[PDB]
Design a protein around this ligand. Structure first.
Ligand SMILES: CO[C@@H]1O[C@@H](C(=O)O)[C@@H](O[C@H]2O[C@H](COS(=O)(=O)O)[C@@H](O)[C@H](OS(=O)(=O)O)[C@H]2NS(=O)(=O)O)[C@H](O)[C@H]1OS(=O)(=O)O
Length: 124
């Protein structure tokens, strides 16, 4: 599994068993272990290992994690020039997976390039 360390505050992306998404700084949290699975080159799904749920971005920018894999569950994974990764919705293509400084997720419609919120380092 991987954990996704967000540059914005040092929060790891967390997927709760019930589908809620947020961030936490605890490396020991069971709900931050993720499986990043390649769908094709540069395209991934993000599954919470504990939750058996896949990260999804909704049409209004909400993040949540669903039991089923749908078209809202795929993301462009890009290694940026600063060597952080970004995860951009394959369906809503201007919007990024992001965490705010409070550890709450950032609405997709409020994200974009240049923001710290969208930058993640995957780690083992
Ligand atoms: C360089 O890091 C970016 O800016 C940080 C900062 O200026 O504090 C921080 O931004 C968040 O906090 C600011 C200030 O908050 S407050 O007014 O003191 O309460 C917010 O203005 C900002 O929200 S907003 O959408 O820009 O209005 C917050 N951004 S966050 O994504 O919600 O965290 C962040 O560390 C970072 O912002 S980022 O570049 O948009 O990620």
């Amino acid at each position: 599994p991987k954990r996704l360390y967000c540059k914005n505050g040092g929060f790891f992306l967390r997927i709760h068993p019930d589908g809620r998404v947020d961030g936490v700084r605890e490396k020991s949290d069971p709900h931050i272990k993720l499986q990043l699975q390649a769908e094709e080159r540069g395209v991934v799904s993000i599954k919470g290992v504990s939750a058996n749920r896949y990260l999804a971005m909704k049409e209004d920018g909400r993040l949540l994690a669903s039991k089923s894999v749908t078209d809202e569950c795929f993301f462009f994974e890009r290694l940026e020039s600063n060597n952080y990764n970004t995860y951009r919705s394959r369906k809503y293509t201007s919007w990024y997976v992001a965490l705010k400084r409070t550890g709450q997720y950032k609405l997709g419609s409020k994200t974009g390039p240049g923001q710290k919120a969208i930058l993640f380092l995957p780690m083992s």
